[PDB]
Amino acid sequence: QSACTLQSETHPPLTWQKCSSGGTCTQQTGSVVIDANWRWTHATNSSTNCYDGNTWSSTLCPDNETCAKNCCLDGAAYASTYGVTTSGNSLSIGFVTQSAQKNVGARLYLMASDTTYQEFTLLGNEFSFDVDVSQLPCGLNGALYFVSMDADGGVSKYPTNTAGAKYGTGYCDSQCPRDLKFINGQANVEGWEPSSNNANTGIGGHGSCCSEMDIWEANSISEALTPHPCTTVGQEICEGDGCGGTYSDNRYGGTCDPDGCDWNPYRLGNTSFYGPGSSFTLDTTKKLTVVTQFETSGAINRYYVQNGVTFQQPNAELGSYSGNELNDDYCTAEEAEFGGSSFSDKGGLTQFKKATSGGMVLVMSLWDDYYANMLWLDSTYPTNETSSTPGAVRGSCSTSSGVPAQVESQSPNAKVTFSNIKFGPIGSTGNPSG
Ligand SMILES: OCC(CO)NC[C@@H](O)COc1cc2ccccc2c2ccccc12
Numbered sequence: 001q002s003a004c005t006l007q008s009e010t011h012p013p014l015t016w017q018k019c020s021s022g023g024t025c026t027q028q029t030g031s032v033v034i035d036a037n038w039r040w041t042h043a044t045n046s047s048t049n050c051y052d053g054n055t056w057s058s059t060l061c062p063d064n065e066t067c068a069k070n071c072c073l074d075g076a077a078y079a080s081t082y083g084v085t086t087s088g089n090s091l092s093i094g095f096v097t098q099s100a101q102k103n104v105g106a107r108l109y110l111m112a113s114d115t116t117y118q119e120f121t122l123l124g125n126e127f128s129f130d131v132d133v134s135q136l137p138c139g140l141n142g143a144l145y146f147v148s149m150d151a152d153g154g155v156s157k158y159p160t161n162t163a164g165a166k167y168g169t170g171y172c173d174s175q176c177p178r179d180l181k182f183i184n185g186q187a188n189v190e191g192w193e194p195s196s197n198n199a200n201t202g203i204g205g206h207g208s209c210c211s212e213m214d215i216w217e218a219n220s221i222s223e224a225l226t227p228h229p230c231t232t233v234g235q236e237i238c239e240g241d242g243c244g245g246t247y248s249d250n251r252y253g254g255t256c257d258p259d260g261c262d263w264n265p266y267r268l269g270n271t272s273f274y275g276p277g278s279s280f281t282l283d284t285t286k287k288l289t290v291v292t293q294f295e296t297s298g299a300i301n302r303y304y305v306q307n308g309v310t311f312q313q314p315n316a317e318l319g320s321y322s323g324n325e326l327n328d329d330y331c332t333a334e335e336a337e338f339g340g341s342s343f344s345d346k347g348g349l350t351q352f353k354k355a356t357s358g359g360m361v362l363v364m365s366l367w368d369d370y371y372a373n374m375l376w377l378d379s380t381y382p383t384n385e386t387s388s389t390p391g392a393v394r395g396s397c398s399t400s401s402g403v404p405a406q407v408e409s410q411s412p413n414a415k416v417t418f419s420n421i422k423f424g425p426i427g428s429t430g431n432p433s434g
């Protein structure tokens with residue numbers, strides 16, 4: 001796709017701190033950009049829609065290449081259309097925003113300049129942020145995560161993408177998403193199937209795969225930490241059901257691991273650690289700090305701070321594993337006790353280390369789940385299981401929760417606020433901000 005300018009594009013600025021081992025930190029100035037799927041896609045020379053509702057223009061977009069030549073992405077009104085704002089080091093995302101139309105959620109990337117994404121090398125480093133999840137009920141996911149996207153949004157590889165990172169192109173993740181409207185500088189109209197339960201979305205014949213580090217998938221009820229390896233580390237197109245992932249008939253038949261090696265304290269048995277109010281170790285009515293450390297062995301460590309009190313990730317015992325470090329003994333034990341082979345099939349933490357050794361893009365989002373109602377995060381899943389099935393219970397939400405139309409109707413003013421991002425060598429991010 002190209003870019004059009006009927007609507008100006010001004011990325012909301014966002015600062016973060018880069019910390020050094022010597023004990024100081026220095027402020028960095030970036031900004032956020034909304035993913036291309038949320039934008040208006042129209043003809044390059046008029047206001048005619050290329051995509052409207054959950055269908056494509058059959059005349060502008062008769063095939064993937066012609067559509068990309070004929071169509072452009074336009075600018076975003078971040079606050080009034082998308083419910084997105086920033087202030088200093090803080091980013092807020094509203095759930096339902098009513099303007100001339102209804103918008104649900106957003107997926108945002110941290111930039112380095114107005115035309116390039118910021119890349120982070122996680123290995124050997126730690127990432128800290130503060131979050132307020134108090135306004136996130138069952139069924140919503142305020143996510144902070146990394147993906148192995150290109151810094152230019154794909155422009156150097158895909159000449160027919162001239163919009164780039166400035167317009168939020170180039171997304172990929174471990175679900176090999178097929179809901180993207182543009183992949184590899186071409187549209188995804190070929191094979192498009194409109195969603196029966198979502199007036200705005202569909203599934204195309206291609207998907208976009210890459211490694212994904214889910215630092216934080218959470219609401220006020222549940223939270224999880226999940227690495228997802230892929231056999232190709234960075235962005236790569238996939239073909240139809242060969243994609244696997246959420247958007248294919250076969251979830252487990254692709255190059256990425258769409259389930260991951262999740263660490264969810266509630267799921268592992270500590271049902272008292274995280275939740276609303278003073279009966280939980282971390283009170284999700286109040287802001288909390290989340291620190292995630294990527295040691296060079298490939299294991300992942302985690303601690304939290306709230307009201308100046310520090311808590312390591314709670315200990316868990318699962319099969320022959322015992323501890324609080326997410327390491328390949330944990331992930332192997334999790335497959336043996338809870339089931340699955342996807343994570344190990346795709347190379348486990350060894351393969352995942354290839355992603356964290358390289359650059360990844362920071363993603364912050366708020367979404368509801370039109371495929372599984374977020375039950376995999378915060379409820380019992382699959383819903384016919386009970387607490388007697390190991391790992392089935394992920395959180396205390398009802399198995400009836402999270403129907404998109406219902407939570408959009410009941411909780412439109414839900415929101416997430418991410419703030420005070422700090423990044424640097426392990427042990428450095430708790431030192432004074434510059
Ligand atoms: O929040 C960011 C997303 C980026 O797309 N992170 C991964 C998320 O897509 C994982 O979703 C799932 C993760 C998952 C893990 C184990 C079992 C089932 C599921 C599942 C089932 C249906 C729909 C989704 C899932």
Ligand SMILES: *[C@@H]1O[C@H](CO)[C@@H](O)[C@H](O)[C@H]1NC(C)=O
Binds near residue numbers: 269270271272315
């Ligand atoms: C849950 O984890 C917290 C933090 O490690 C710990 O203080 C608490 O005792 C744990 N509770 C249970 C029931 O495991």
Ligand SMILES: [Co+2]
Binds near residue numbers: 206239
């Ligand atoms: Co193809």
Ligand SMILES: [Co+2]
Binds near residue numbers: 295297299325
């Ligand atoms: Co270690």
